[PDB]
């Protein structure tokens, strides 16, 4: 029921809509952290609490492991889950619109004037 | 034809459809009464 121009415009809206949402979302880090220690006896006695100068709870939080010296909602978190899905929903529509656009382009390509033996190798004048 | 609508557009379209159904019911009810008379 729609033409190629209409589907292309919608997909572009989602792509820019997706970028703004994805930019504004926050994703927790998963990289590996390594510490260089001068001596083996220093290595054996090392513990995360001492090195970061934090409590055990803050050690797990890599993003905001506040120093211990510095230390001295079901509806709310649901809105967060809806919100991460909402970026997923844009991601799902974008691929779905992409699939429709790909099929439309193929049909127009077949309609194009060509040898179409699969296209025979022929230089177009 | 298949189309894709935002939230605000959907609310406007739903509001219109509600109004026409109310108008259709009210118009028919008046017709039936005057038809009975």
């Amino acid at each position: 029921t729609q033409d190629s121009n209409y589907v292309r415009t919608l997909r572009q809206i989602e792509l820019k809509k997706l970028e703004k949402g994805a930019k504004q979302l926050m994703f927790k880090s998963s990289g590996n952290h390594t510490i260089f220690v001068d001596s083996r006896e220093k290595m054996n006695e090392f513990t995360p609490e001492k090195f970061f100068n934090t409590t055990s709870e803050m050690v797990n939080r890599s993003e905001n492991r506040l120093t211990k010296d510095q230390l001295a909602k079901e509806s709310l978190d649901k809105k967060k889950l809806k919100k991460f899905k909402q970026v997923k929903q844009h991601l799902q529509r974008e691929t779905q619109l992409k699939q429709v656009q790909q099929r439309m382009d193929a049909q127009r390509e077949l309609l194009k004037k060509g040898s179409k033996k699969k296209w025979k190798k022929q230089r177009k004048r | 034809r298949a189309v894709v609508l935002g939230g605000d557009e959907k609310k406007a379209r739903s509001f219109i459809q509600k109004v026409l159904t109310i108008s259709k019911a009210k118009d028919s009810k008046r017709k039936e009464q005057k038809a009975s008379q």
Binding site: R93 | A2, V3, V4, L5, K10, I16
Partner: peptide, 11 residues
């Protein structure tokens, strides 16, 4: 024209 059009891909 709203009757003519149909809505798809809804969230």
């Amino acid at each position: 024209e709203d009757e003519d059009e149909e809505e798809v891909l809804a969230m």
